[PDB]
Design a protein around this nucleic acid. Sequence first.
DNA 1: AGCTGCCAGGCACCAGTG
DNA 2: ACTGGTGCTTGGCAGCT
Lengths: 787, 753
Amino acid sequence: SAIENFDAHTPMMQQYLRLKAQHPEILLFYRMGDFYELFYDDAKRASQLLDISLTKRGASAGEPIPMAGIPYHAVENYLAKLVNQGESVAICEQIGDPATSKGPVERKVVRIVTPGTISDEALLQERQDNLLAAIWQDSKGFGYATLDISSGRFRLSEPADRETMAAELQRTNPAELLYAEDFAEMSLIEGRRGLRRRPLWEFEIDTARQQLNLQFGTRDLVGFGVENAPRGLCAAGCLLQYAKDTQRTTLPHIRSITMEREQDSIIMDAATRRNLEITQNLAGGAENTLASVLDCTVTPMGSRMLKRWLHMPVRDTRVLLERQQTIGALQDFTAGLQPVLRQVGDLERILARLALRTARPRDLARMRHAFQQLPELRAQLETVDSAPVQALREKMGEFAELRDLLERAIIDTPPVLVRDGGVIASGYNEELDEWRALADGATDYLERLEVRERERTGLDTLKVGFNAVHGYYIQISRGQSHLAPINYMRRQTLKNAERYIIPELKEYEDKVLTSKGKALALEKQLYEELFDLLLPHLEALQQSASALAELDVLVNLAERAYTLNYTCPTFIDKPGIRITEGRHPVVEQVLNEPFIANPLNLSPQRRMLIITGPNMGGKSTYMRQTALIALMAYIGSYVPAQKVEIGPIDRIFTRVFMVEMTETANILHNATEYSLVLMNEIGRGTSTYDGLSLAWACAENLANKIKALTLFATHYFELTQLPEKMEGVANVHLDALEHGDTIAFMHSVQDGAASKSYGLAVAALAGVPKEVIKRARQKLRELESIS
Amino acid sequence: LRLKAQHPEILLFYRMGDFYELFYDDAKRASQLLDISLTPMAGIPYHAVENYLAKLVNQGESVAICEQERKVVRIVTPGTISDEALLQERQDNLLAAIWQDSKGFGYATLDISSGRFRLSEPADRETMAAELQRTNPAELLYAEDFAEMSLIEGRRGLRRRPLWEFEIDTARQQLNLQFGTRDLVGFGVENAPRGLCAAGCLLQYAKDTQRTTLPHIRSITMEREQDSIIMDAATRRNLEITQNLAGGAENTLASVLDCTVTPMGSRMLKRWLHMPVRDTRVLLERQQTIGALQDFTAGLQPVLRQVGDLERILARLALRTARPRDLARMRHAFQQLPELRAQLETVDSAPVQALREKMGEFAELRDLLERAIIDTPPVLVRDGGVIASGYNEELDEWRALADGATDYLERLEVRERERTGLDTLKVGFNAVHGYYIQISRGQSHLAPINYMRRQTLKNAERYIIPELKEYEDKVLTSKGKALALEKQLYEELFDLLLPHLEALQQSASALAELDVLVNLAERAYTLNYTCPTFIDKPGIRITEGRHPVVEQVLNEPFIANPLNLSPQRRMLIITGPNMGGKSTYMRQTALIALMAYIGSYVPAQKVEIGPIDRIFTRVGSTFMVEMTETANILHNATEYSLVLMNEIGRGTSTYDGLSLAWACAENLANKIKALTLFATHYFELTQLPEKMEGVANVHLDALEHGDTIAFMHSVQDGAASKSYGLAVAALAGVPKEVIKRARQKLRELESIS
DNA sequence: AGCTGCCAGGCACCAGTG
DNA sequence: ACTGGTGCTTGGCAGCT
Ligand SMILES: Nc1ncnc2c1ncn2[C@@H]1O[C@H](COP(=O)(O)OP(=O)(O)O)[C@@H](O)[C@H]1O
């Protein structure tokens, strides 16, 4: 309706609309003195989201402007509300001085708070990573980049197909996801939280390289091993531009980037991560997962590292051997190291706020406290004989000098904010504790002026006091007020009292507030100056936090191994899995009855097992424990068995309609002889035998061509004939015994096909009427007479 | 501390500042329930406390409120709230009590707002389980010696009660007292002891939560098994009646049938959907109404909408908690009745005219509320400005006095301003100082000497003078007497309205049902439904039937299908692809039966249908679950049952599964004789019709064209003669060579039989 | 311990007097 | 153009009880 041309707007709205256009789709907090305000649809939304009153800002020429707002000092509680809902918010501040500005004071968006770029402790989860990610798709593949803005961890990868792209998204589970406007495979990302559509130009390869190299201080990206990963570079370039625009400061903690090559780790598809319940159970909870058993780390950063390891098993033999050695060597040390490591806390995220220059007084306080743990940690670790632990000990560093700085600079228990001062300890700066000496030391004066004037006037109600609004005063009761000296200058009247000012008290008032201002400005400048002193050491600090997190992980793994009775696995050259008395690491902890340990023997000659046995026999658990044991071995952990020898695993596949078949094909197209394939219940055709026929042909392809290590749980008794027909296939089964009426589930794996199929017995157990089980048994004997 | 001891299993909201606060386990729990920070301590903003009580009670938590020294002044329990803010408009909220004899079960539910009070005596566990699912109580009372804890243990709002709260003699005495009856014969529950024990407990608990008479609870009804189509939880969930498999409400039967215009209508329609009645007399009557009201829905619905949730408004009347906009909405509802009475006048239908009469008019009550209350009264009566001028002479007098006093002060402002020549001069008001004369700081030194200064502001001075305080008393005493008067006249409205509560409850009930029937009429017109007919023996004959939801939700053409079931053609074996077409065909059969049996029109060109005692589905250890559901069908289905089964036998060996499907089919066809759609992949089962009377084959087929396959949804006679797994494997990308081997294997496996 | 309402500091608005 | 009063969010807290 109203024509909103430039000249139709007040200078305020011209300024505002100009800043708002700079972020058309996200809420804009617009600083107006003591309030952050919103206008138009921002006001309406904010009013709905934050439960604040929708009001109006009058207009002489035009429509009234919808309006909402909150006091500047309350902004964090509200940012919490918004980012907790996936909402970005641009934060706009007053840069200019109102007193020296004819028009509206200069304003700027200084920061944009988005779900994947938060670094404030209030807004994060301690034991969970919170990543920003960018995704890109061209004609022949995907590019993908993640950034942990709190740690600087910057990763790049190029999933070759849709299936690995999906798996990658599920693993990294970004809180915010930037995607190019021309992204075609939307089914992969639509309905993820934190979606952000971006213009194609943010993905341009040349700017990506220019910007990254600028960020890293490099001439090219060769040394980062990403110089030839253009798909990935396009996503990384977009991600980095987003990070810079949201923070609008230097990001010195983002100092390198690393490519995630497929050969470096065990690739797990979407269904495997979920079926193994690694960090999430099948109902979306965190209870009864692999992490819930293994993660007894003591620092938040360690908890997160462990979870990353578990989702990303490494295939580097030397790394694994080194972690294994570390776990052995530290086992008798865990009790003493853990209480100390605990006191280090989340050094990694504190350092993020250091690099971002947003660190608050308690952040530095906690940084100090961590530094104070280092010598003790150094002392405990000197004794331990193993190279890797000494490597970590060196990397942990010591920062006695920085520790001393923080001990001299900041009081024992600082306030939350530096905004009001009382953060910089006395003795640190001669000028400061001398402004305080004024602003504060002369508060004795008020007390004595009171008794002096009270005795001099003889008015016993006389009190000296202070009021933010009216300033310092001498107060007399209304009853006595007619008796006051005539050079008492009335300052403030109340119902039952009069308040006055005299020249002496007025001078003190200017003295106090001038020097109070001095102290606080100078204190803020000293606090900022601590950033200048700490920052030069950022790189060694991050190394330290990294060392400390890895120590937390390895120490915890040593304690788990001991307490849960785990063994060190050994690595063989050829594909294979030899397990003696293996257990399911989660199920054995959950069950309140004994877990039946089981063997496994897989080799290039015995590479596929057809697993039979009843429903509830333990086929699924057996297949899962196999993959968990492999996974654990490949993060350097000890494993829940009496002994394990394991060859290399390139990838773990899981398959347990169009969807079954499409997943099956994916195995058939991508599995290799180094793959572990776990399969169940495949073969749901439309008739009696079409499904089973596909299962048979798919198995044959896995046994004869692909040659993957394959555990194939099935109830199709026809498939127990496979070993007869093709090389590399053998039968095993989960033992069960029938005692008259019932069926006993032994949970023990035995060579050979099951003696029989127990569909009828399991049906009976479920309660199917006995007359019907009886007629079914009669039908079964007919079918079995074909043999 | 000590106040928490009074109520141990109830969260304590502790009044402390501008907030309430919970500590320890209460802070722990509250934080994980309300997405709120845990410092142990947690806080709630006073302005939005009701927004939190609603969330906590929705999750089954009672909340105790400890105001100001201090004591528990308010308690809300999930099953006994009646405030609008705490309820959801279109969902019933029930209190239930559950009891187990060394004989059978006892169950009772109460809608505390409508007063709808139901009793039943489920005979076995499954039936009791079904009852819980259907009724989904927000709060559930149970005896301490309750044996079948597995029925209830997972539920929200569990309330463990002493066994003595479940005694027959005191339950009777209490129930009789409540109803003002000598015995319960007139309610048809006099000899339903187990039911009565449950109702006894429930009613005591509800009385205890309110500490008020509950006059709107004047009746109780027994639910007998032969009265409705029984559905177990799986069947209920599988039919996505009001809840879809996801847990939501989109793409459900209600989501398509429910375009009612009042919240009470929506809630009542939903009860109907979950309780199909077997009494054709009621159905015929509902059908006739839907037919007679077809042409009228257009004019009726805008009017019915204005009636609103008169049902929950009347609860607040009965509990004496009704607020002014509650009375104005009742007024508004009253103002619709003559128009509704006039529209329904010509409708030649005895059920419609019964509704018209039972709807009433209350012209005297309408007129009262028009004279008593202003057009749009404030939310609370607390601050007055509720009672309309002209209603009470005395009231008008106190307001006129208050008004002359305030006019004088307005004129005082003017007189004092002109007289002093200070253009900032104003008269104002606040609590601390009452009436005052304000002058800006810059002018305050020109204040006239008679001005007594009382309050300095940053940029203004405030003064009093005798004249100001004189008319202050005038304003305040009159305005005081007027406010006290409003409150009495307001209470008096409850006294004049309450005697008509019974009639008023019948009226909101009539109005609710009209919303439902009129809506079903519009539905039947808009979605091209037809009126089913009822036959005496089991049978289901459908001409061109469709699935009520699929046809609306999916923007593809829906393919309609016949069905012919009778005692001579009791079971259909259904082969061919199951890519949704078999399941849909089976579910639409159930849904059509359900709709017929709530009196709705149904989506077909013609439906004749016999009596149905129960509808079972087994569609969509998995095998262990499927067999457990199969078992329940085989133990409980009769020849009046509709049994729908998909592909049992999956999840075990070919031969065990076939043997089980075969034996199950035989038992259904020959022993039970239920009307059964038996969907299967077993081609071997298509041999049943030769060996067995009353069984026949039908199948779905597909068509292969272009670079795809079109899965037809047309049900045709005979067994399927193709399988499609290989065609699917190929579309899905399974390598050509692999499918070729599968083809050879397939022929080899099939040709043996 | 309340409960009421001023104030915070931006900018625009408006009515009077140039 | 000046002058000097008004208004608008929410949270802290003085100034009354
Ligand atoms: N090795 C074992 N020892 C003891 N109990 C087991 C073992 N393996 C499985 N179970 C238990 O038996 C149940 C059936 O196991 P599952 O693997 O689901 O059976 P299947 O997949 O063969 O039907 C599981 O709930 C599990 O708790």
